[PDB]
Amino acid sequence: LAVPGKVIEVNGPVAVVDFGGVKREVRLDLMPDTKPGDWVIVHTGFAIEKLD
Amino acid sequence: LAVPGKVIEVNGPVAVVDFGGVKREVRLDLMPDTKPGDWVIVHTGFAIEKLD
Amino acid sequence: EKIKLEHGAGGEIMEELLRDVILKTLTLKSAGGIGLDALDDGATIPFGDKHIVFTIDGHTVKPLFFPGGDIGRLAVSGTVNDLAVMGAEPIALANSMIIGEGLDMEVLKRVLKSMDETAREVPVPIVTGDTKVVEDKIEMFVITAGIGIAEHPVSDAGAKVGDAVLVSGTIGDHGIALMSHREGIAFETELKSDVAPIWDVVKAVAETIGWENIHAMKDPTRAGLSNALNEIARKSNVGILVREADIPIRPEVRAASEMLGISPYDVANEGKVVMVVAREYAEEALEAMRKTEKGRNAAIIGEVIADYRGKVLLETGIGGKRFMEPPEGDPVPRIC
Amino acid sequence: EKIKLEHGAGGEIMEELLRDVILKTLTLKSAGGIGLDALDDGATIPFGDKHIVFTIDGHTVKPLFFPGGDIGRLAVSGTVNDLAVMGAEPIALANSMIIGEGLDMEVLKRVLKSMDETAREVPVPIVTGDTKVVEDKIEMFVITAGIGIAEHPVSDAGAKVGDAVLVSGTIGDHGIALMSHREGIAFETELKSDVAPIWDVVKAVAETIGWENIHAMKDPTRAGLSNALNEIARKSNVGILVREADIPIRPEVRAASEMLGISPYDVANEGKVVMVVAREYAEEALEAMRKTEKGRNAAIIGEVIADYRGKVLLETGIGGKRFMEPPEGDPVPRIC
Amino acid sequence: PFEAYRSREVAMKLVEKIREEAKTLDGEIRIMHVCGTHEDTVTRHGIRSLLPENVKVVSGPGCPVCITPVEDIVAMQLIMRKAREEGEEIILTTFGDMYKIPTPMGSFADLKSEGFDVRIVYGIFDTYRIAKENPDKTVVHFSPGFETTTAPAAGMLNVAAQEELENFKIYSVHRLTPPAVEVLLKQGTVFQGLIAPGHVSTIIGVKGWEYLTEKYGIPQVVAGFEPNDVLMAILMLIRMYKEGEARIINEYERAVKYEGNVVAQKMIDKFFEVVDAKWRALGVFPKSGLELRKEWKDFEIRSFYKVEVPKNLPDLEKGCRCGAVLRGLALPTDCPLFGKTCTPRHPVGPCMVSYEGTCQIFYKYGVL
Amino acid sequence: PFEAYRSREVAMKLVEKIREEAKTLDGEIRIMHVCGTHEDTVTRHGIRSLLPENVKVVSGPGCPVCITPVEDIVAMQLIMRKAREEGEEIILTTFGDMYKIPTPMGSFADLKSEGFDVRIVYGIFDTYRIAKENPDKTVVHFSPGFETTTAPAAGMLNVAAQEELENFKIYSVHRLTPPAVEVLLKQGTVFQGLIAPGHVSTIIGVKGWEYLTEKYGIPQVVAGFEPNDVLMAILMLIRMYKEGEARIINEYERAVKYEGNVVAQKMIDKFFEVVDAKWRALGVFPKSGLELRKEWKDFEIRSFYKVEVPKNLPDLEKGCRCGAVLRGLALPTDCPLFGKTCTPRHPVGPCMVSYEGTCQIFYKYGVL
Ligand code: SF4
Ligand code: SF4
Ligand SMILES: [Cl-]
Ligand SMILES: [Cl-]
Ligand SMILES: [Mg+2]
Ligand SMILES: [Mg+2]
Ligand SMILES: [Mg+2]
Ligand SMILES: [Mg+2]
Ligand SMILES: [Mg+2]
Ligand SMILES: [Mg+2]
Ligand SMILES: [Mg+2]
Ligand SMILES: [Mg+2]
Ligand SMILES: [Mg+2]
Ligand SMILES: [Mg+2]
C-alpha cells in the first residue's frame, strides 16, 4: 500500500515525509537526489521515486 | 490453632480424622497407639495426644 | 501509592479507597434519592408513586465453578439480592461479560446456562448486555446491573433502637465452602455455597408484616455479616447487640473456619439477607422467613441498642462481651 | 472450541457467538419492550406514559489514556450515547470497576476525574457502583450501566424506504487515532479521539423535527460505521445507499488509515451518532446538528432504499458500486 | 493535488469513452493486471461495475506473499528450531500477512506461540534496527516480494556491508514480475491487454516490460493506482487492441522513468542474481527468482544452516483454488470456501491471508 | 461433646465463684499465660470483661513466630541468595504468618517477589512431600515453634533419616517455653499465677513445669483452650494464691499425661539439644533454644552454607512495643501504632503479623 507524501526534511539517507497531517521517516537510499518540497512514493519505508 | 477430631481410619503412620463433617489426614508418628474411634489433638497435621 | 488486593475486599481498607478517592473525586452522585454517597446496596430514583432501584455488581470469583454454584448463578443472585434488600422487586437485568482469549466455549455455555436457570427462578429477564474479549489471562468476569421497582424503599440507615436483627439463614457458607474447596479440605459431604436469589424471602416477610416494618436490610456479601452489621450500625448511627449463640452456623462451617483460622462472620454470604424489623414484628418476620425454602434456618440474632452507636457489640457464648470488628478486608481471595 | 479475540470485536464473528450461544442459551430476554434478542443499543421497559431505557457497556481500552480521552471519559460517553440513540434522556449511571493489583493510585484518580468532568457535561450523575481488585495484570476495566427515560423510543428497525441517513460528524477518528498512537505514527498535529457524550446532538434534532421523525439511530462504536449501518439495514429489513463522497473524513484519518491498511468505516467512533430521518426533515436535522459543538461536521451520507434489503450499498467516489461489508471484527485491538 | 486522478467527472468521462469503444467490439476483451494494489484499486472503487459486459479485468499473480513457496516458509521454521538446539536464538522478522501464511506444517505465528522470537515489521529497515539493538542475537528477515520490495532490501544490504554487520541476515524469496507474466502466456492464460504494475515499473521502468510486447505483441500500459489511472489504462488498452497496436504506453509517467530507477537496479544487481524459482500453487517459473550472489552469501540465513525440508508438501489445502485465482482464471467467489471456512480472520489459502491477495480484497470489499 | 467446656451455665458459675473469691481479695492478682491460643480464647470469648477489677490476665511470650530472631530470618534469606549464585535453587517452606514477618531487610514474601521459590506450608510434612516431588532441588523449611511444633519436626526428621533423604533440610529456630518463663521471673515480670500452655504441656507433661513451682513457688495450672478451661484455671489459681498454695494442677488432664508424651520427648531428644538462644525483642535467654545435634547436622541448612549476617539489626521498628507486649507488661492498645499504621494487613511489628500474636488477636477481636 504505497502512498504519496511531501518531503519536509532531508538528512543524508533519512527524510521526513508528510502524508496529509501524518509524518514518517523514510530512507532515501533509492532517491539520493531527494530534497525538501519533493513528492516521493514510499514503499516499506523507502522513497522509490519522485513525482513530476 | 489445634482442634479435636475423631479418628475414622488408621494406616500405620497416616490417619483420617473427622472434625465435624470435615476430614483430613494426620500423621500418627507421635500417637502410634491411635486407632479408629479415638479423639486426638491435631497440630500442624500431627496427632499429639488422645482424649480421655 | 499503589492499589492493593485489600482495596477491593469490601472491608475497611476498601472503605478508605472509597472515601479517600472515589466519593472524593466524583461530584455528581445522586438522582433525587439514595445516591453514591450513601453506599447502599443500590440507588433509588423517585418516579411518581414509586421509586426505581439501580444496582450494579462485578464478579471475579475463581474458580468460575465451585460447590453449590458458579460465577453465573452468582451474577444473577448478587444483583437480584441488592435490589431485594433495597425493597425493590427485580424488573430487569443487564449483563456485561469480559472473556479471556482462549476460554473454552463450553465454559461460557455452562455459565450462561446457570445464569438462565437462576434468572428464571426469580423470575427476572436479562434485557440487555455487552461482550468483550481480552488477551489477558482472566478466564471470565461478569458484571451485572439491575433495575427494580420499590413501592417503599429501605436503606441501611433506617434501623431504630429496640428493633430486632435477623438473618435469613446460616452464616459463612459461601466464603468457607470456597476456601475449603481451594485447600482441598475434603468433607464427609461437601460444604456447598449458598449463592441464590432471595427476593422471595424478603417479599415473604414484607407480604406478612408490611414494608413499613422492615427498617433496614443488607445482603452480607464481601466482608461478611460483621461488615454488613457494622455498616448498618454506622449509617443508622445506632448500636447493635448480637448474641453469638443465636447466629446460625453449620457444623461443617464452624469446623472449616477454625482449621482455616478465619471467622465465618467475616466472609461473604451469597444467599442471605440481614433484616432489621420493628420489635413487635420480629417473630412474624422470622416465621415468615422460616416458611420459605431459603429461610428455613432464619434466626433473630440481636437487637438495635442505644449504646455503642456505630459499633457492633457481640455477646459471646459464655456471656462475655466484645466488639464484632468489621474486617479490614474479606479474608478469602477472589471470593466474588 | 475456544473463544477468540474476534468473538468480542463487535463484528460478524461476534454476531455468531451471540447467535450460536448467548441468545441461544438465555431464554428470558425481555421486560415488555425491546429486549436482548433485538440487540439494540439498549432495552426498553414500558412504564405508563413513558419507557425506561436500560443499557450496559464494558470498557477495556488500552492504553487507559490516549489522545483526546481516556477509559473514564469513554465509560460515561459510551453509556450516555447508547441511551441517547434509543431516544432516552440520561437519568443515572452505575459504575463498576475491576482494578488490577498494583495500579498507581494516581491513575485511578485521573480516570475518576475524567469520568466526573464527562458526567457533568451531560449532565448525568453516577448514583451507584462497585469496586473489585484482582491480581491479574489488567490495569483497569470500567463497566457502566445506565438508565434513561424515553418519551418515544427509537430502534434499529424503524428505518423506512426513502428516509435519509446522517452521521453527526467525521468517521474513523477514535479507532485511527488510537491505532496511530500505538504505531508511534506522529502527526503535524496529533489525531485525537472523538470520545464524548452526544445526547445534546440527538436532543437538538429531536427538539427541532420531533421524535416521530427520527426513525432509527445507533452510535457506530465497535466495527465502525459499516457495522452500525449493516445492522440497521438488516433489522429494518431495508437497503441502504451511501455515497462515499459525502461521508465526512478528516485528512489525517484518511492518511493514517491508508498507511495502516484499514478502512475508517470499520473502526469504532466514540463521539458520533448515525441517524435515519424522514426524507422531508433531513435538512433541518442536518442543520440542527450543524448548530451543536459536536455536530458541526454532520452530513447526509445516503438514503434508505428498497433494493438490496439487509445490505449496505456503497456508491464510490468515481461512481462505481459495491457493498460496504460489515467487518468480521473491529481491526484495532483493545479499541474500547 | 492529483484531484483529477480521482475526479468523479474525469472518471465518468473515461467510463463513457470505454463504453463507446466497446459497444462496437466483437467477442470479448480481457485485460490482466499483475499487481495486488491494482486489484485493490479496481475492487475498492467498484470499477468492474462500470465496465461493459464485453470488457473484463482479471487479476494475475500480483501478490508476492501469496506465491512464496511453502517449502521456503517451512525451511525458515526448521532453521529457527535448528538454531535453538544449537543454543543460538534467532530473531525473525516478517511482514504482517506473511506472518500468518499457512503451510502444511504451520505458520510463523504458530511458531511464535512455541516461544520463538518472531517479529512483524513494516520494512527491512526495521529488521536492520533490530540487528543493532540485539548484537547478542542473529536477526533474520524472511524476505519475499517483487522488484519494488527487493530494492529496499538491496539497499539495506549495502548499508549493512559497509557497516560490516554480522548479525544481519535474510532468507531471500524475491521474485520477478515480467518472467511470470511470460510463463502465463506460454500456458494459455487468456488476455489481450496487460496493465503493467505501477510500482514495479518505477523500478525497472518502461524498459523492463518491452521484451514482452515485442516477443508476443501484447499491448502493455504502465499505470498508477488512482481509480482514473486504471480507467485510463483500460481505455488505452481497448484502443490498442481495436487498432491492432502492439506497444507500451506509460500512463504512469509522473512516477516512472523509461529507464526506471538505475540506482535500485544496480543496487539489486550488486547483490542478487536472477535464478529459477518456484511460485506457490503455480509451478517452477524460469529465471523468475532472485538469490544472493556467491559473495554476499554471508547475508543469506541458509549459508549458516542446512535443513531437510520434507518432500511432497502440498501447496494448498484441499478445496482451495488460489492457484487459479493467481492465474486470473478464477474468481475467489468461484471458490466453495470463499466467505465460508475461508475469511481474512480464519484463512484457508494464501490468497485470503495476503493484503494484496485477490481473495482478501474481494472479501474485504463485498464484490457485486 | 465437651459441651460443658463451652456451656454458658458452667461459665457463669465459674465467673461467679471467681468474683466471690476476689471480692475479699486485697491488692491485685496477676495471672500470666504463655500461649497465643490461650490469648485467643481469653480475647475471643470476652473473658476479660467477665473478670473483677482486681483480677488480671496477661499474655506472655506465647508466640514462636513473634520471637524468632531477625538475624535468623535474614540468615535464611542470605542463604537463598548464596545458593542462587551457586547455581543451586532452594525451595523454602515457611508458615503463613512467618512468611510475612518483617525484618530490617525484608520478609520471606519480599524474597518471593524477587523470583525466589518460597512456599507457605501448614506443617513439616508438607515440606517433606515437596522434598520427594522435587529431587532436583533442595527443599528447606524455616522451622520456628515451641515444643508442640518441635515434635512434628523431630518426628519428620526420623522418617527422613530412615528414608535416607538428602534434600530434606530445615533451619532450626525452635524454642522452649519453661526457660523463657523463668527468665521473665528473674527480670521482674509481675504475676502471682501461671496458666501453663495446654499443648506444650501435652508434650512435656505436667512434669516439665514442676521445676518452676518448686524453685520459685509459683502456682501453675495446665489448662485446655475452651472458655471454661481458662475460667476454671483462673479460679483454681486465685485460690492457690489466697491459700498460699504452691503446686501444679492439671486442669487439662483429659489431654495431658503427667509424664506427658514420651515418644515426642525422645523423638525430639534424638535430634535436638537445648542451647542458648535469642528471643526477638526480648534478649538472649539461657538454654531456651533447640539446635540439631552434631550427628543430625546434615539436616540443618546452615551446615551447607555460611552467611555473614550484618550486625546491629534492630529487633523492631521505631515506636513498636511488641517487646513489652511479649512480656505481658504492655497491652497492644498502649501502642501508638496499634490500629493506626499497624494492622494485620499492613503490620509494623511481629506481634501483629503472627496468628498467635497478641496484637493481632486484640485487633482481630475488638477488645473493650
Ligand atoms: S478463498 Fe480461500 S480457500 Fe478459496 S482460493 Fe481464495 S484463499 Fe484459497
Ligand atoms: S501494634 Fe504493631 S507496632 Fe504496636 S507493638 Fe503491636 S505489632 Fe508492635
Ligand atoms: Cl458485593
Ligand atoms: Cl460498544
Ligand atoms: Mg449489597
Ligand atoms: Mg452493591
Ligand atoms: Mg453486592
Ligand atoms: Mg456494547
Ligand atoms: Mg440496604
Ligand atoms: Mg450502541
Ligand atoms: Mg450497547
Ligand atoms: Mg455501546
Ligand atoms: Mg457490590
Ligand atoms: Mg438503536
Side-chain angles (χ1 to χ4, degrees), chain E residues 128-161 163 165 167-185:
Chain E
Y128 165 85
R129 178 190 55 223
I130 291 179
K132 300 200 63 184
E133 316 184 306
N134 295 263
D136 290 342
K137 280 173 284 186
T138 310
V139 184
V140 53
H141 169 81
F142 196 75
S143 181
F146 289 154
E147 299 91 339
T148 316
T149 302
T150 301
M156 192 57 51
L157 283 178
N158 212 36
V159 172
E163 279 211 356
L165 256 168
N167 69 324
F168 182 73
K169 312 312 176 192
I170 66 172
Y171 187 129
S172 180
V173 210
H174 294 290
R175 300 285 180 270
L176 308 163
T177 309
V181 179
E182 182 178 71
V183 180
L184 256 54
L185 291 160

Side-chain angles (χ1 to χ4, degrees), chain D residues 34 39-42 81-82 84-87 154-157 215-219 231-232 235 274:
Chain D
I34 297 173
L39 289 182
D40 213 326
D41 299 281
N81 293 356
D82 271 320
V85 294
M86 285 316 280
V154 180
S155 83
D156 310 321
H215 303 179
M217 281 187 291
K218 175 165 294 295
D219 47 332
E231 215 171 304
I232 285 172
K235 296 167 197 180
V274 174

Side-chain angles (χ1 to χ4, degrees), chain C residues 6 13 258 313 315-323 325 328-330, chain F residues 8 11-12 43-47 49-50 227 343-345 363 365-366 368:
Chain C
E6 291 60 57
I13 295 177
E258 281 306 293
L313 220 68
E315 181 177 353
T316 62
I318 63 175
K321 304 281 173 53
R322 80 171 171 67
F323 294 111
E325 287 300 302
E328 272 194 286
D330 200 306
Chain F
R8 186 195 189 78
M12 287 324 275
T43 300
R44 189 198 300 203
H45 301 285
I47 287 178
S49 65
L50 295 175
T343 59
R345 271 299 102 75
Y363 186 83
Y365 293 119
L368 281 193

Side-chain angles (χ1 to χ4, degrees), chain F residues 3 5 31 63 69 96 119 140 158 178 212 231 236 313 363 366:
Chain F
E3 165 266 314
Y5 294 112
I31 302 168
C63 167
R119 308 181 189 180
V140 53
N158 212 36
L212 294 187
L231 284 176
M236 303 177 121
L313 280 168
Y363 186 83

Side-chain angles (χ1 to χ4, degrees), chain E residues 5 13-15 17-19 21 29 31 51 55 192-196 218-224 228-242 244-254:
Chain E
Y5 294 112
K13 292 181 186 175
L14 294 178
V15 170
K17 292 189 176 181
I18 293 175
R19 285 171 174 164
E21 292 279 43
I29 179 179
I31 302 168
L51 297 174
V55 182
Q192 297 68 58
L194 179 80
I195 297 183
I218 171 67
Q220 299 182 246
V221 175
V222 174
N228 293 328
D229 276 345
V230 178
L231 284 176
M232 240 294 91
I234 294 174
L235 184 60
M236 303 177 121
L237 283 172
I238 295 184
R239 297 175 168 172
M240 291 196 277
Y241 171 61
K242 289 183 65 169
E245 301 195 35
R247 60 191 178 78
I248 299 178
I249 299 180
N250 186 337
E251 188 283 331
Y252 204 22
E253 48 170 46
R254 68 177 182 288

Side-chain angles (χ1 to χ4, degrees), chain E residues 316-317 319-323 325 331-339 341-343 347-353 358-360:
Chain E
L316 304 173
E317 283 289 2
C320 179
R321 298 148 73 135
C322 173
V325 167
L331 296 166
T333 43
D334 292 346
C335 179
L337 313 184
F338 186 80
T341 48
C342 195
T343 59
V348 180
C351 286
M352 184 61 83
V353 180
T358 302
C359 292
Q360 190 179 93

Side-chain angles (χ1 to χ4, degrees), chain F residues 319-323 325 332 335-339 342 347-353 359:
Chain F
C320 179
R321 298 148 73 135
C322 173
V325 167
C335 179
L337 313 184
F338 186 80
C342 195
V348 180
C351 286
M352 184 61 83
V353 180
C359 292

